[PDB]
Amino acid sequence: SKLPLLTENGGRVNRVGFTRIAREGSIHKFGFFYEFTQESIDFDSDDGLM
Amino acid sequence: PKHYGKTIKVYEYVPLLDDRNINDQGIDASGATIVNGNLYGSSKDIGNIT
């Protein structure tokens, strides 16, 4: 029922259109940290703690 | 030094002839077991020492 049949007379028949889409992504920020005192590394048994 | 906590410990070695040398190793001159293993300890009495 939707075939682009064309007659001998031509004319403005079977005009089509096009479209495009836009994709998108974004970045976000992350991070974490830890704290320590001088005594927690100086008096700690393990010198390789850090 | 580092990595040994905050406490310092040291041994004191009591002399053989001391009243606070309390041990159960005592065997007397005749071979009998005695309650003291420090000979006469801190005694200064001639009778006890003899």
Curated annotation (Swiss-Prot), chain A:
Q: Give the subcellular location.
A: Virion
Indicate the segments annotated as coiled coil, or none if absent: none
Function description? Assembles, to form an icosahedral capsid with a T=9 symmetry, about 60 nm in diameter, and consisting of 535 capsid proteins.
Name the record gives this protein = Major capsid protein
Q: Which residues of the full protein are shown?
A: 102 to 151 of 401
